[PDB]
Amino acid sequence: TFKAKDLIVTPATILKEKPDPNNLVFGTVFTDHMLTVEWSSEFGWEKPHIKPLQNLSLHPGSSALHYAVELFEGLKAFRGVDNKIRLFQPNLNMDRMYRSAVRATLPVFDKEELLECIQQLVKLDQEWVPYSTSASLYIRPTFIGTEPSLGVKKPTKALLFVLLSPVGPYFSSGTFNPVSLWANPKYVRAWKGGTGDCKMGGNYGSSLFAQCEAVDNGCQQVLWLYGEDHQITEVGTMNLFLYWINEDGEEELATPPLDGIILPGVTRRCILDLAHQWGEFKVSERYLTMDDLTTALEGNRVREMFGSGTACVVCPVSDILYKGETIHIPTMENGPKLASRILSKLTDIQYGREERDWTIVLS
Amino acid sequence: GTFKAKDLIVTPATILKEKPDPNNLVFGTVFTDHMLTVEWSSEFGWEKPHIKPLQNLSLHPGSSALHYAVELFEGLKAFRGVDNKIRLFQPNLNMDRMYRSAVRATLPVFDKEELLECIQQLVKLDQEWVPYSTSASLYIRPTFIGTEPSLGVKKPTKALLFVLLSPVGPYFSSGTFNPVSLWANPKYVRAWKGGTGDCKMGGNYGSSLFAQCEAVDNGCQQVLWLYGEDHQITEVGTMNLFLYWINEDGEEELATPPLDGIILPGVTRRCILDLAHQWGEFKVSERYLTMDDLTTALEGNRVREMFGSGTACVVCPVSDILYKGETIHIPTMENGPKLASRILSKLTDIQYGREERDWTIVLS
Ligand SMILES: Cc1ccccc1Oc1cc(N2C(=O)CC(C(F)(F)F)=NC2=O)c2ccccc2c1Cl
Ligand SMILES: Cc1ccccc1Oc1cc(N2C(=O)CC(C(F)(F)F)=NC2=O)c2ccccc2c1Cl
Ligand SMILES: *Cc1c(COP(=O)(O)O)cnc(C)c1O
Ligand SMILES: [Mg+2]
Numbered sequence: 001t002f003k004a005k006d007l008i009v010t011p012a013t014i015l016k017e018k019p020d021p022n023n024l025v026f027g028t029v030f031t032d033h034m035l036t037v038e039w040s041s042e043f044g045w046e047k048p049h050i051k052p053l054q055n056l057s058l059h060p061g062s063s064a065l066h067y068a069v070e071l072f073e074g075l076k077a078f079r080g081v082d083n084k085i086r087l088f089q090p091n092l093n094m095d096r097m098y099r100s101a102v103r104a105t106l107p108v109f110d111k112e113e114l115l116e117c118i119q120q121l122v123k124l125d126q127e128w129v130p131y132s133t134s135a136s137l138y139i140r141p142t143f144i145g146t147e148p149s150l151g152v153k154k155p156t157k158a159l160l161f162v163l164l165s166p167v168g169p170y171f172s173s174g175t176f177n178p179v180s181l182w183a184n185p186k187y188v189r190a191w192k193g194g195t196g197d198c199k200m201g202g203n204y205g206s207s208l209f210a211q212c213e214a215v216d217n218g219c220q221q222v223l224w225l226y227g228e229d230h231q232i233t234e235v236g237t238m239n240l241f242l243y244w245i246n247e248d249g250e251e252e253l254a255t256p257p258l259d260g261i262i263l264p265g266v267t268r269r270c271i272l273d274l275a276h277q278w279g280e281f282k283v284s285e286r287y288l289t290m291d292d293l294t295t296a297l298e299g300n301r302v303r304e305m306f307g308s309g310t311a312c313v314v315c316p317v318s319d320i321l322y323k324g325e326t327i328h329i330p331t332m333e334n335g336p337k338l339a340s341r342i343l344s345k346l347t348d349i350q351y352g353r354e355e356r357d358w359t360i361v362l363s
Numbered sequence: 364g365t366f367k368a369k370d371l372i373v374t375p376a377t378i379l380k381e382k383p384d385p386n387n388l389v390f391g392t393v394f395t396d397h398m399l400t401v402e403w404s405s406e407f408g409w410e411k412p413h414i415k416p417l418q419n420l421s422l423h424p425g426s427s428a429l430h431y432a433v434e435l436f437e438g439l440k441a442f443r444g445v446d447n448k449i450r451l452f453q454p455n456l457n458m459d460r461m462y463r464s465a466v467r468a469t470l471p472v473f474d475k476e477e478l479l480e481c482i483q484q485l486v487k488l489d490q491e492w493v494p495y496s497t498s499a500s501l502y503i504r505p506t507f508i509g510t511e512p513s514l515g516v517k518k519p520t521k522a523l524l525f526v527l528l529s530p531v532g533p534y535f536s537s538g539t540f541n542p543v544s545l546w547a548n549p550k551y552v553r554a555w556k557g558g559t560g561d562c563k564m565g566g567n568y569g570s571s572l573f574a575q576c577e578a579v580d581n582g583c584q585q586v587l588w589l590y591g592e593d594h595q596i597t598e599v600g601t602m603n604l605f606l607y608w609i610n611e612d613g614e615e616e617l618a619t620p621p622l623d624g625i626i627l628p629g630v631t632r633r634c635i636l637d638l639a640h641q642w643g644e645f646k647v648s649e650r651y652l653t654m655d656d657l658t659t660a661l662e663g664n665r666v667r668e669m670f671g672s673g674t675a676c677v678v679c680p681v682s683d684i685l686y687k688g689e690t691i692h693i694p695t696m697e698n699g700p701k702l703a704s705r706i707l708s709k710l711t712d713i714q715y716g717r718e719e720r721d722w723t724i725v726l727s
C-alpha cells in the first residue's frame with residue numbers, strides 16, 4: 001500500500017483565480033492540484049502524486065465506465081474564526097471509504113496514509129479553503145476500476161484520486177431556505193441486501209430520473225420512500241430528522257435506523273450524539289411512515305423536519321408532495337428552534353469557535 | 364435530435380494489430396483496431412459520429428460516469444456464417460433496450476436506426492476481426508457515459524456514446540455443455556421493485572462482483588439471484604433463468620420469471636419465449652418461481668431442465684444450487700438436456716446462417 005512519505009509533488013506553474021464564494025455553483029469549480037495513485041494486481045500500489053488538475057487517460061474498457069466499479073467520499077475543510085483550517089471526523093470518512101472498497105472488490109489501502117496524502121493536497125491548495133464562516137472546501141476522494149477488460153470481474157487495475165472544490169453557502173440568503181420534497185413510492189433508492197449504506201457510484205445514477213421528476217413538479221429534493229408502509233428514509237442525499245410529539249405524547253427527535261438502506265452520515269451520528277448529550281427530549285432511531293407523519297400533522301404534533309448531511313448541515317423541510325396533494329410541514333413556524341440550535345452548535349465546532357474531539361487542525 | 368450515419372467521419376488506423384487465434388480467446392481482453400465515438404452537449408446536441416483508431420478516453424476527473432455511475436451499455440454479437448456472410452442477430456432489440464436505458468439514466472436520446480447503421484459501418488471496417496470459427500463471434504459493446512465536469516448530482520449536460528469490438532471464443536472452451544453450480548445466498552439482492560434492474564445501467568453490476576467472488580470461494584461458477592421473503596429465483600449471474608418442469612397442475616411447462624421490474628428483458632429470453640410459443644408443444648408461463656417451488660418439484664421428480672440464457676451463453680445448463688448449506692442437484696444433464704439442446708441448435712443455426720430467419724441481418 002502507498003505511503004504519504006513517498007508523495008511525488010509536481011506543482012502547477014500557473015495558478016487559477018479563486019471564485020467569489022457567494023457566486024459558487026456546487027461541484028463546478030476545481031482547485032489547482034489533485035492526488036492520483038495507480039494500482040495493479042501485478043505491481044501493487046504506485047507512489048502517490050500531487051500534480052496539476054488534469055484529464056484522466058482511461059482505456060474505454062475501464063470497468064468504472066461499464067459496471068460502475070467505483071466509489072467516492074465527501075468531506076469538508078473549514079477555515080476557522082482563528083484562521084486554522086480544520087477537518088471534521090475525517091477518520092470516519094476513511095473507514096467508510098475502506099469498507100466501500102472491500103464491498104466493491106477495489107484494492108484496500110492504508111487509511112492513515114490516504115488521510116495524510118489528503119492533508120498534504122489541501123495544505124498545498126489551502127488558499128482555496130474559503131475566507132467565509134458559511135463556505136468550505138469539498139474533498140472528493142474517488143476510486144475507479146481501470147481494468148481494460150469487459151469481463152465482469154474483480155479489477156486488476158484501479159485509480160484512487162482526490163479532487164478539491166470550494167462550496168459557498170447552501171442558502172444564498174446565508175440562513176434557512178426551506179425545501180419542498182417529491183414523495184413518489186414508484187422509485188426506491190436502496191433495498192435490504194443492497195449497497196445503500198456505501199457511497200458506491202451505482203447508488204446515485206439510478207436516482208437522477210426521480211430528481212428530474214421532483215424538479216418537474218416544482219420540488220427541490222426527493223423524499224425517498226421504502227416498503228409497502230411508505231417508510232420515509234432520506235431527504236435527497238441527506239439523512240432525515242423529525243422533531244415531534246410521538247404516539248406516547250413524548251417530545252422526540254426521530255431518525256430512521258441504520259438497517260442497510262440508510263447512508264450512515266457523519267452529521268447524522270453527531271446530531272444523535274448532541275441530542276443524547278442535551279437530554280431535553282427522547283432520541284429514537286426508529287421507522288417513520290408517511291401515515292405516521294400525516295397522522296401527527298392532523299394532531300398538530302409535528303414541530304420540525306430537516307435533512308442533515310455533507311451538502312447541508314441542517315436543511316429545513318416546509319412541504320411534501322404525496323398522492324397528488326401538497327402537505328405543509330410547519331418547521332419554519334416553530335423557529336425552527338432545534339434546527340437553529342443544531343446549525344449553531346455544528347458550525348461553532350466546524351469553524352473552531354469551540355474545542356472538539358470532532359475536529360483536527362490541518363497537517 | 365440525433366447524430367446521422369451519413370455524417371460519419373472515418374479515420375483509418377495506419378498500423379493494424381495481429382488477429383488472435385479463434386481457439387484461444389479470453390472474453391473482453393482483445394479489442395479490434397477501430398472504435399465509434401459521438402460527443403453530445405445540451406448546448407449544441409449531437410456532434411458528427413467518428414470511426415477512428417481505438418484510443419484512451421480523455422475525461423475530466425469530475426465526469427459523472429466516474430462518480431454517480433451515469434452510464435449504460437449494450438452487448439450484442441456479429442457472427443461469421445458457414446457461408447462466410449457476417450450477420451447481426453436481433454440488433455433492433457438491443458437498440459430498443461439502449462434507448463430505454465438512456466431515458467431511465469437521463470442521458471440524451473438518439474435515433475436507434477442511425478446508431479445501428481454507425482455500428483454496421485464500424486463492424487464492416489473491422490470485419491476481418493469477426494472470427495473464422497462457427498463457435499466464435501465479435502462482441503459489440505455500445506457504451507454511453509456522462510462526461511459533465513461537475514460533482515453536482517444532476518442530469519448530465521455532456522456525454523459520450525462509444526462502441527468497442529472484442530472477439531470472443533466459445534463460452535465453454537471444450538465446445539460442449541459444462542453444467543454450472545449456482546451459489547444462492549439471499550443476503551445479496553441484485554435488483555428491487557422501483558430500481559433499474561430491467562435496464563443495462565452500469566450501477567446494476569458493480570454491486571455483484573463481491574457476490575461472484577463469494578460464489579467462486581464456495582466452488583460455484585455463478586450466483587443465483589434470490590428476491591424477497593419467499594426467495595424467488597430471478598437470474599443466473601448475468602443470464603435469464605428458465606425452468607422446464609411439470610408444474611403444480613401436472614402440466615409440462617417452460618417457466619421464467621415475469622418482467623415485474625427486477626428481471627433484465629434479455630434478447631435470448633425473448634427468442635426462447637418466441638420459439639416456445641411458436642412450437643406450441645407445452646405451456647409457456649412467465650410466473651414467480653421460489654426455492655420452495657423448486658425443491659418441492661425436485662422431491663416429486665417433476666423437474667426436467669434448468670438453464671441460463673444470455674448473449675454470453677445462449678443456453679447454460681444448471682446441475683446444482685448451494686442453498687442453506689446443502690447442495691441441491693438439478694437433473695438437467697440426466698434429461699438430455701433435450702429442450703436446452705433443441706434451443707442451442709436452433710439459435711446457433713440462425714446466428715451462423717445455417718437457416719434463414721427474420722432475426723438476422725447480413726452486414727451493410
Ligand atoms: C459482459 C457482460 C456484462 C453484463 C451482462 C452480460 C455480459 O455479457 C457477458 C458476461 C460474461 N460473464 C462475465 O464476464 C463474468 C461472469 C462471472 F463468472 F464472473 F460471473 N460470467 C459471465 O457470463 C461473459 C463471460 C464469457 C464470455 C462472454 C460473456 C459475456 Cl458476453
Ligand atoms: C455530491 C454528493 C453526492 C452524494 C452525497 C452527497 C453529496 O454532496 C453534495 C450533494 C449535493 N447535492 C447535489 O449535488 C444535487 C442534489 C439534488 F438536488 F439534485 F438532488 N442535492 C444535493 O444535496 C450538494 C448540493 C449543493 C451543495 C453541496 C452538495 C453536496 Cl456536498
Ligand atoms: C445482459 C444481461 C442478460 C442477458 O440478456 P441478453 O440480451 O440475452 O444478453 C441477463 N441478465 C442480466 C442482468 C444482463 O445484464
Ligand atoms: Mg500503515
Ligand SMILES: [Mg+2]
Nearest residue numbers: 655658659662
Ligand atoms: Mg420443502
